Enzyme design. Structure first.
Site, PDB file in Angstrom:
ATOM      1  N   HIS A   1       3.970  -1.478   3.124  1.00 17.49           N
ATOM      2  CA  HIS A   1       2.853  -0.735   2.825  1.00 17.49           C
ATOM      3  C   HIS A   1       1.921  -1.288   3.936  1.00 17.49           C
ATOM      4  CE1 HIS A   1      -0.430   0.190   0.080  1.00 17.49           C
ATOM      5  NE2 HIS A   1      -1.236  -0.589   0.650  1.00 17.49           N
ATOM      6  N   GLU A   2       1.680  -2.372   4.442  1.00 17.97           N
ATOM      7  CA  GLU A   2       0.718  -2.784   5.506  1.00 17.97           C
ATOM      8  C   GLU A   2       1.338  -2.000   6.729  1.00 17.97           C
ATOM      9  OE1 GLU A   2      -1.781  -4.143   4.984  1.00 17.97           O
ATOM     10  OE2 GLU A   2      -1.324  -4.662   2.923  1.00 17.97           O
TER      11      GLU A   2
ATOM     12  N   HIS B   1      -0.466   1.222   6.949  1.00 19.07           N
ATOM     13  CA  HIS B   1      -1.848   1.250   7.422  1.00 19.07           C
ATOM     14  C   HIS B   1      -1.767   1.129   8.872  1.00 19.07           C
ATOM     15  CE1 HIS B   1      -3.555   1.235   3.691  1.00 19.07           C
ATOM     16  NE2 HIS B   1      -3.297   0.046   3.149  1.00 19.07           N
TER      17      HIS B   1
ATOM     18  N   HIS C   1      -4.875   4.485   1.686  1.00 18.03           N
ATOM     19  CA  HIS C   1      -4.338   4.726   0.490  1.00 18.03           C
ATOM     20  C   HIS C   1      -4.136   6.152  -0.287  1.00 18.03           C
ATOM     21  CE1 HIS C   1      -5.659   0.194  -0.201  1.00 18.03           C
ATOM     22  NE2 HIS C   1      -4.521   0.518   0.394  1.00 18.03           N
TER      23      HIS C   1
HETATM   24  C1  LIG Z   1      -0.806  -3.316  -2.204  1.00 17.76           C
HETATM   25  C2  LIG Z   1       0.295  -2.606  -2.207  1.00 17.76           C
HETATM   26  C3  LIG Z   1       0.836  -1.595  -3.060  1.00 17.76           C
HETATM   27  C4  LIG Z   1       1.783  -1.107  -3.185  1.00 17.76           C
HETATM   28  C5  LIG Z   1       1.967   0.466  -4.044  1.00 17.76           C
HETATM   29  N1  LIG Z   1       3.557   0.537  -3.994  1.00 17.76           N
HETATM   30  C6  LIG Z   1       4.587   0.078  -4.829  1.00 17.76           C
HETATM   31  O1  LIG Z   1       4.213  -0.728  -5.562  1.00 17.76           O
HETATM   32  C7  LIG Z   1       5.719   0.875  -4.700  1.00 17.76           C
HETATM   33  C8  LIG Z   1       6.881   0.010  -5.152  1.00 17.76           C
HETATM   34  C9  LIG Z   1       8.098   0.674  -4.711  1.00 17.76           C
HETATM   35  C10 LIG Z   1       9.401  -0.263  -5.442  1.00 17.76           C
HETATM   36  O2  LIG Z   1       9.399  -1.002  -6.226  1.00 17.76           O
HETATM   37  N2  LIG Z   1      10.470   0.265  -4.767  1.00 17.76           N
HETATM   38  C11 LIG Z   1      11.878  -0.500  -5.189  1.00 17.76           C
HETATM   39  C12 LIG Z   1      12.249  -1.649  -4.376  1.00 17.76           C
HETATM   40  C13 LIG Z   1      11.360  -2.644  -3.698  1.00 17.76           C
HETATM   41  C14 LIG Z   1      11.851  -3.656  -3.041  1.00 17.76           C
HETATM   42  C15 LIG Z   1      13.035  -3.948  -2.588  1.00 17.76           C
HETATM   43  F1  LIG Z   1      13.414  -4.669  -1.761  1.00 17.76           F
HETATM   44  C16 LIG Z   1      14.146  -3.068  -3.203  1.00 17.76           C
HETATM   45  C17 LIG Z   1      15.659  -3.081  -2.873  1.00 17.76           C
HETATM   46  C18 LIG Z   1      13.791  -1.868  -4.019  1.00 17.76           C
HETATM   47  N3  LIG Z   1       8.341   1.858  -4.063  1.00 17.76           N
HETATM   48  C19 LIG Z   1       7.282   2.517  -3.608  1.00 17.76           C
HETATM   49  N4  LIG Z   1       5.835   1.890  -4.051  1.00 17.76           N
HETATM   50  C20 LIG Z   1       3.029  -1.670  -2.355  1.00 17.76           C
HETATM   51  C21 LIG Z   1       2.885  -2.876  -1.640  1.00 17.76           C
HETATM   52  C22 LIG Z   1       1.576  -3.228  -1.696  1.00 17.76           C
HETATM   53  F2  LIG Z   1       1.177  -4.553  -0.755  1.00 17.76           F
HETATM   54 ZN   LIG Z   2      -3.012  -1.165   1.310  1.00 18.22          ZN
END
Ligand SMILES: Cc1cc(CNC(=O)c2cc(C(=O)NCc3ccc(F)c(C)c3)ncn2)ccc1F
Ligand SMILES: [Zn+2]
Ligand SMILES: [Ca+2]
Ligand SMILES: [Ca+2]
Ligand SMILES: [Zn+2]
Length: 169
Positions: A119-120, A123, A129
């Site tokens: 995510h970071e 950015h 976002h």
């Molecule tokens: C502030 C902020 C906001 C977000 C928003 N996005 C999500 O929450 C998100 C979560 C996932 C997800 O759960 N995927 C499955 C997964 C995850 C990890 C892993 F190792 C494996 C093997 C599999 N996919 C897309 N988006 C994210 C980080 C953040 F800092």
């Molecule tokens: Zn963010």
């Protein structure tokens, strides 16, 4: 002559990163693995290359810190803010900071470092976002529990609008 680019993005495909320090929560190997995988999320869908530097100045400086740590965005202890990254640009541009008052993990407990890092870095590369609740760039951490991570289309379309798709296959 040259006018400033239309969008905030890196003007070079070869980018470097450096893990300045490490959180007490995970081993060095776990942290390195998490960040490497996070960068691969983006390099896999663009022409971008990420090379790790062990010292010196890299395009994306990565660090863990608490409260005041060197910028106008101090962290706030446990809970609340968890991390942030600066958009493409000189000096601190692109840098990623993780609040070390949070709990970082390589599992589903606390905050998954890989997920937050992915995510970071979005950015760090120029993405803000998204309003798509299922996007990686959605503003609220929403771990899905799935066993396999797949970059959502919204994020793919967004990052490619800036850097192109690179090899499509
Ligand atoms: C502030 C902020 C906001 C977000 C928003 N996005 C999500 O929450 C998100 C979560 C996932 C997800 O759960 N995927 C499955 C997964 C995850 C990890 C892993 F190792 C494996 C093997 C599999 N996919 C897309 N988006 C994210 C980080 C953040 F800092
Ligand atoms: Zn963010
Ligand atoms: Ca916090
Ligand atoms: Ca930088
Ligand atoms: Zn910061």
């Amino acid at each position: 002559y040259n006018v400033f680019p239309r969008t905030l993005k890196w003007s070079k495909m070869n980018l470097t990163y450096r893990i300045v320090n490490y959180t007490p929560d995970m081993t060095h190997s776990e942290v390195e693995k998490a960040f490497k995988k996070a960068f691969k999320v983006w390099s896999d869908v663009t022409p971008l290359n990420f090379t790790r530097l062990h010292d010196g100045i890299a395009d994306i400086m990565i660090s863990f810190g608490i409260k005041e740590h060197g910028d106008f965005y101090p962290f706030d202890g446990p809970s609340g803010l968890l991390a942030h990254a600066f958009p493409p640009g000189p000096n601190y541009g692109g840098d990623a900071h993780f609040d070390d008052d949070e709990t970082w993990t390589s599992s589903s407990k606390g905050y998954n470092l890989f997920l937050v890092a992915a995510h970071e870095f979005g950015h760090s590369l120029g993405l803000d976002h998204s309003k798509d609740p299922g996007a990686l760039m959605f503003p609220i951490y929403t771990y899905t529990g799935k066993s396999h991570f797949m970059l959502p289309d919204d994020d793919v379309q967004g990052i490619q609008s800036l850097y192109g798709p690179g090899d499509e296959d």
